[PDB]
Amino acid sequence: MLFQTSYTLENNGSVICIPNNGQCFCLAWLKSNGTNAEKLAANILQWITFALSALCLMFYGYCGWEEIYVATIEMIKFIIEYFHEFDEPAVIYSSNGNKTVWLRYAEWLLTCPVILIHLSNLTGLANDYNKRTMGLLVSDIGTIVWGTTAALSKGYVRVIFFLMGLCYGIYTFFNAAKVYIEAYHTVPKGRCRQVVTGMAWLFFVSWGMFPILFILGPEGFGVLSVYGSTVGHTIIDLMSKNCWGLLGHYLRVLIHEHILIHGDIRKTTKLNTEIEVETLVEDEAEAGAVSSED
Amino acid sequence: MLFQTSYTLENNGSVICIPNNGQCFCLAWLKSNGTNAEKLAANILQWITFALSALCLMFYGYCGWEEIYVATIEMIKFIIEYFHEFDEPAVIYSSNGNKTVWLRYAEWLLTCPVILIHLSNLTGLANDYNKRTMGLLVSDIGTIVWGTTAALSKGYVRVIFFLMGLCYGIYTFFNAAKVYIEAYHTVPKGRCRQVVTGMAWLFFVSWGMFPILFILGPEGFGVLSVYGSTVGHTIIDLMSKNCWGLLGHYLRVLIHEHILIHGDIRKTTKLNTEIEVETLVEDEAEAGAVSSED
Ligand SMILES: CCCCCCCC/C=C/CCCCCCCC(=O)OC[C@H](O)CO
Ligand SMILES: CCCCCCCC/C=C/CCCCCCCC(=O)OC[C@H](O)CO
Ligand SMILES: *C/C=C(C)/C=C/C=C(C)/C=C/C1=C(C)CCCC1(C)C
Ligand SMILES: *C/C=C(C)/C=C/C=C(C)/C=C/C1=C(C)CCCC1(C)C
Secondary structure, three states: OOOOOOOEEEOOOOEEEEEOOOOOEOOHHHOOOOOHHHHHHHHHHHHHHHHHHHHHHHHHOOOOHHHHHHHHHHHHHHHHHHHHOOOOOOOEEEOOOOEEOHHHHHHHHHHHHHHHHHHOOOOOOOOOEOHHHHHHHHHHHHHHHHHHHHHHOOHHHHHHHHHHHHHHHHHHHHHHHHHHHHHHHHOOOOHHHHHHHHHHHHHHHHHHHHHHHHHHOOOOOOOOOHHHHHHHHHHHHHHHHHHHHHHHHHHHHHHHHHHHHHOOEEEEEEEOOOEEEEEEEOOOOOOOEEEEOO | OOOOOOOEEEOOOOEEEEEOOOOOEOOHHHOOOOOHHHHHHHHHHHHHHHHHHHHHHHHHOOOOHHHHHHHHHHHHHHHHHHHHOOOOOOOEEEOOOOEEOHHHHHHHHHHHHHHHHHHOOOOOOOOOEOHHHHHHHHHHHHHHHHHHHHHHOOHHHHHHHHHHHHHHHHHHHHHHHHHHHHHHHHOOOOHHHHHHHHHHHHHHHHHHHHHHHHHHOOOOOOOOOHHHHHHHHHHHHHHHHHHHHHHHHHHHHHHHHHHHHHOOEEEEEEEOOOEEEEEEEOOOOOOOEEEEOO
């Protein structure tokens, strides 16, 4: 540690004395991060993630910028974890006694908006983004900022900022859901609709797990230890980023093959909220005005 | 303060003893935030900003969501400053001795992307955003994340993260410049082109001042004190947000009046990098294919 770890209790445990060496001191910081079993598990999941993220980068290496940016950051993340995981400021040890994993929240700020940009162009064919895309990004940034602030805070201050994060988060989840519904009815009828369905399940489950891990972790009720929280977070990271990004590359190849073999043939379908989506079709026998009541 | 402020030096200044009351302690945290003159100046500029931001909200209150979101956050910001400016986590007092103004960086994360979204639709007429818009947002988020990490860090770690912020920042500034060039040649020939020119000056000067205030502040070489840094930051905040947002509302009204009186009549002008922009014109005697060599 690069904070003070050696001290003496004096006067029946009522006074703590430390070397006057300029280092900060706090008992709360010295609480254990967890068991050796938790530590072993965390280093394994990290290695798996560093390696798999590096494989994904090379694999994608065989437009497309979103999968690479996230996979690059994940890799960079491990080297910092690997060398300085518990060094400030990968973990912030603050005057109120909290341990805040800035690396995680910073990583979310780097990667989550890019995932949402990817989500807004699942097929990869669009060159533009609507107004709703922008709201998705702004709501998600706020979620992380409130969540980070909550983690840095204590008591009632933590609770309030968490709840604003929850309000921002619901708005994010709701609009993400809207995007996936449009995407499902946009992509061709076969395999493309299977992949999109898989991504929705992956997305809502993995992203939905995050507020739960927060509540359980040191940032909340301290059920999970620091290592415990790391293991959980790396799991849902693999889901939310690596696996989801894999599917996204796969989905985009499938969309590309469809347009190469069949061309870009569109049919307008309307979904009655009442939304309209231009579905990709396979042959020119369809170019009509189809609908679908929900 | 809610950290330890009372201590005794023992053994010829080599041992510090504190009450064992659970509070964290560090000498670095107790350095003064600055002179009383600096404090007075900071409270004045904050009040000016709280009031003026509230005026802007009501004033805009007489599409348009970007001016309100930023002005709302600025207002909320002051109430937190007003009650808990130097309470954790508005300022983070970390184990490495740094004081990091999380409120500022968090505020930047909330407001700067929205300013850039505004910038990407200065006229307010567009319903879509290109790929380049998305890069603008992603580069800017990275800047803040690296800058925040640099502020939280020390020594060579601070320097590296600052430089990545600088690389991200240049990419942001460059693309912002691209947007303003397109915007200038898009808006009508008269007053609209004056306002856009004003915004470019405001934008690059106020945003450009931020890395400079960083280098001078406690986050860098400690030339400026904490209060000193606050005063500077509130000034360029008024420029980057309040004044710029004012012009943006004004610019959008002017664009709206043009389309109401004259309708939406466009002419394609091409700018030889070679870029094409559809300029708004006043009468149907222009609908041609004009160009302009740079
Ligand atoms: C994400 C979109 C779908 C929403 C589903 C969300 C997942 C579960 C959240 C649940 C209830 C909120 C719980 C609020 C309590 C949190 C307060 C806290 O963290 O505890 C602080 C306290 O000071 C320490 O003792
Ligand atoms: C923003 C786009 C246009 C670019 C214009 C930028 C404005 C000026 C930046 C300049 C040089 C960079 C200076 C790099 C030195 C910073 C390192 C530092 O902060 O000092 C840490 C040290 O450890 C404490 O003693
Ligand atoms: C790669 C990392 C990802 C996809 C992280 C996602 C994180 C979230 C969806 C976090 C959500 C939260 C809330 C819904 C409420 C406030 C607490 C948070 C930040 C954990
Ligand atoms: C309302 C707040 C605004 C507009 C803040 C803008 C901040 C910046 C443009 C900061 C830029 C930085 C760099 C260019 C390099 C790294 C250090 C920063 C974060 C100060």
